[PDB]
Design a protein around this ligand. Structure first.
Ligand code: ZN
Lengths: 225, 104, 95, 55, 57
RNA sequence: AGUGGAGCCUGCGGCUUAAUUUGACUCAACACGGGAAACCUCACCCGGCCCGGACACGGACAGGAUUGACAGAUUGAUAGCUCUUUCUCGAUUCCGUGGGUGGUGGUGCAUGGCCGUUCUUAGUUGGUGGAGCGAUUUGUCUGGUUAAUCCCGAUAACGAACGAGACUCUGGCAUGCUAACUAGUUACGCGACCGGUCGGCGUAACUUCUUAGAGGGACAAGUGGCGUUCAGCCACCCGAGAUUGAGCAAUAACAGGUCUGUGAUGCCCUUAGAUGUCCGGGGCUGCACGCGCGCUACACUGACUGGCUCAGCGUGUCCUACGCCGGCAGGCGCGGGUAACCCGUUGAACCCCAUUCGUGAUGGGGAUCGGGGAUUGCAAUUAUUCCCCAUGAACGAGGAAUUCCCAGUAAGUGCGGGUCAUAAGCUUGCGUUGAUUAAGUCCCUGCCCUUUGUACACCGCGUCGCU
């Protein structure tokens, strides 16, 4: 007797949600990017993606042990069945999930908003994106809540491409005055995935190969080969 | 440069066995390090004698370069409706004759 | 809360370094403390008594408290249970 | 309260025995397919659970 | 798996709805071979996101 | 087709109430807050219970700090809640000083996020070049063109990018492909009945029906007119389609809603007879009256009864088949199904044939009211529902005004999901039956868009009184 396939796939995604939320909660100040759960009946391998792997590992490898034992104790599945593996992002700048947590830490560290936003902006513009934007909203310079917007490069706001090119990542930062929201929409480029960018191009761009310059006919030549 | 209807130069490309050569794959990461210019200077307390050092390399009080960088950083704390640009990435030595007009 | 529950909670803490809850006061007992009859309200509050003492860290996510052991919190359990120092917790065993 | 009369009411039947697993709120709960998620925290984790608004 | 929900988290708007969907595709492939072959065929081509159920006899 | 004219449900006001939490108030509130509430929900009221006050200081405390407690009194309560009764318990503490926690407690005019609206529009903005000292202007048009600043062509402009389009999902087509014992057909055989029927049984094929993946297919393609004979517009052949329905949705904005969705949240208020937790009961539903959706009808194109006969989404570890007792609601036993395997070939309704009723507030229509029965639940009193007799009332097509809709559309008709221990008059979807008119305008209203002028001028508030 097992769980029905509908509730098997519903309860599988909720496990991927609680673990992701917890790893965000803990490693907000460690450059954590994401979770790749690969299910193996021997041991389920959870690959954590983070910016600096030495911070999440810690000295001697002590921090990930608490993590793997917590996820052993919480989710009910028996011990000796989960294997955590911390790994670096293929492109740290291009991944907006890891990047949007950097600006949160920069604002939390006492920076002026506009300077750190330009820092993140130029870092991800030089990182290789075709276009990006950052919207920080809140009580920036007063009791009146104005909105701040940094746009350069290109953007696709509508159409199926907006599902697999832009990487929307909203985060909340807690300051003395209150709460500021951060949106970082980084559009992925083309050049299919040698660890960078999706395969299919934008569903509008047509590129035309120039012809090979062929030999114009001068004399009918019969060459036996 | 950015057109949708584009041309491809594939036929004129001669030889490309190993396209992913390790020359254009430089890992540029300077944000979390201490090499990013977008970081506070950890300000020194104000000198009382009005200068730092001696001899010919005496760095004075205002010291137009330093004061220009300071005025740029003071621009960074303006109103949200103001637009600045990239004044820290490019070394912007902005003077009080200009900064005071922008502040006004 | 009795001292029997206080010792029963502390025994599990040192050997693993990990301990959770469900944030249910009206829960009858905590499932990890099997055959011990320790209600989870006593577990969560007596464990929270060490949060203000700086021996543990909270990390809350989806109705479930998650905790770790500080290096200074290792020695706080080595004199309560009088565990001699040649035994190690779960942190210092592998690699 | 008193131990014999603190949870004296049974908590098997009635919607007060059902709370969202994220926000512990009990208004607007999706019990279909065993989500047990709030209808307002569902729009937060819809993309992560594997739901795609195709049409 | 179709779940309709209100877009508005307070219920003030113009009654706009989200039709969230999960799509589950099911495949059935049958073999007739001793059980050691199916294990070595399945165990090599392991790909995440696609999962395998094995029923014997 | 209605709504507004009736009845009823629901929501918002007012009136009462101890409380009848709460927000939202032209479109852009009023079956909305997944808000169909027996407790919970629950914020509100009437009363109780507990600290579930972390941590620091000081005092108390081992010659006890205390916890829990049988019996009686009180108590709705084997509420030590308090008293008598004196039994337990080994610092797990207690009292003040500090400050932490918990708030569905205040501010959406302090906020984030989300959502709604201007707008499902028709714009938005650079680069280089020209003109001007400069504000600025051309590009961003005379004209034509389109659902579209969509396009053509003029042209000191040339090229772009976002939006629209493209895209993605769904629907119509494939007798070509892939392959099915968890789908179906044909053949043969076995029967059963009178060469015909079998959803009645098994192996040969097979993919037409059914599944669901690739690929194909439709482009103003071809023809005739119109055309500044460009862009494109009307008509026709062939074709399944000369073309559906949604998702996504730019720049600039709104003191639009939400602290009441969050262990989102800044300033806070309270914090031990608590605005914290839990429990008991009540209330959110109370009714003179008003305002919005929605559902039944006003009968004959109808109602009753019998017979006949066809779906689609799509749930289900609870869904249920089958047998037995009951008039129904229901009850008992034995099964299957964690699922195209079982419910189910989903014998659905409207509709189709026959009987009776024949213009009658009539058997139309069932508001109101009594009695009984069964189920779900600790608890149905405020009828939770469901069932059976009886009661049968307004209502005989609706004033001013007003909503929605162009083709599998409107209407009619039922099924599934959400809410659900108990449940749909709501809503989200789904099939079934299936139309009338028009294919045109600024006449109302609303929104545009171009041109010209363009950064509150003047003549028509008083009389008396003392210091
Ligand atoms: Zn959910």
């Amino acid at each position: 007797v097992q769980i029905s396939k509908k509730r098997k796939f519903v309860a599988d995604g909720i496990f991927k949600a609680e673990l992701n939320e917890f790893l965000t909660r803990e490693l907000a100040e460690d450059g954590y990017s994401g979770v790749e759960v690969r299910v193996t009946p021997t041991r389920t391998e959870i690959i954590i993606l983070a910016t600096r792997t030495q911070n999440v590992l810690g000295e001697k490898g002590r921090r990930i042990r608490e993590l793997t034992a917590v996820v052993q104790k919480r989710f009910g599945f028996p011990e000796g069945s989960v294997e955590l593996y911390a790994e670096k992002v293929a492109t740290r700048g291009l991944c907006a999930i890891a990047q949007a947590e950097s600006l949160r830490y920069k604002l939390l560290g006492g920076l002026a908003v506009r300077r750190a936003c330009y820092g993140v902006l130029r870092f991800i513009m030089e990182s290789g994106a075709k276009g990006c934007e950052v919207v920080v909203s809140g009580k920036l310079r007063g009791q009146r809540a104005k909105s701040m917007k940094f746009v350069d490069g290109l953007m696709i706001h509508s159409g199926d491409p907006v599902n697999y090119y832009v990487d929307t990542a909203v985060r909340h930062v807690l300051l003395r005055q209150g709460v500021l929201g951060i949106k970082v929409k980084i559009m992925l480029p083309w050049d299919p995935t040698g660890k960078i960018g999706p395969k299919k191009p934008l569903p509008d761009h047509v590129s035309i190969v120039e012809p090979k310059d062929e030999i114009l006919p001068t004399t009918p030549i019969s060459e036996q080969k | 440069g950015d057109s949708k209807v584009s041309i491809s130069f594939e036929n004129y490309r001669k030889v490309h066995p190993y396209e992913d050569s390790d020359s254009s794959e430089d890992e540029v990461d300077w944000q979390d390090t201490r090499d990013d210019p977008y970081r506070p200077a950890k300000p020194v307390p104000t000198p009382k004698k009005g200068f730092i050092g001696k001899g010919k390399d005496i760095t004075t009080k205002h010291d137009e370069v330093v004061c220009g960088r300071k005025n740029t950083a003071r621009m960074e704390n303006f109103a949200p409706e103001f637009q600045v640009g990239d004044g820290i990435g490019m070394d912007l030595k902005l003077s009080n004759h200009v900064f005071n007009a922008l502040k006004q | 809360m009795p001292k029997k529950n206080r010792i029963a909670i502390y025994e599990l803490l040192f050997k693993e370094g990990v301990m959770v809850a469900k944030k249910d006061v009206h829960m009858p007992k905590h499932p990890e403390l099997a055959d011990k009859n320790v209600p989870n309200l006593h577990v969560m509050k007596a464990m929270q008594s060490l949060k203000s003492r700086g021996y543990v860290k909270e990390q809350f996510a989806w109705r479930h408290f998650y905790w770790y052991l500080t290096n200074e919190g290792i020695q706080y359990l080595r004199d309560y249970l009088h565990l001699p120092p040649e035994i190690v917790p779960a942190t210092l065993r592998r690699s | 309260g008193h131990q014999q009369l603190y949870w004296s009411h049974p908590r098997k039947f009635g919607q007060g025995s059902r709370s969202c697993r994220v926000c512990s709120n009990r208004h607007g709960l999706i019990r279909k397919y065993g989500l047990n998620m709030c209808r307002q925290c569902f729009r937060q984790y819809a993309k992560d659970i594997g739901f795609i608004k195709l049409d | 798996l179709r779940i309709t929900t209100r877009k508005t988290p307070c219920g003030e708007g113009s009654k706009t709805w989200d039709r969230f969907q999960m799509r589950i595709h099911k495949r059935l492939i049958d073999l007739h071979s001793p059980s050691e072959i199916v294990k070595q065929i399945t165990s090599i081509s392991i790909e995440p996101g696609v999962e395998v159920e094995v029923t014997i006899a």
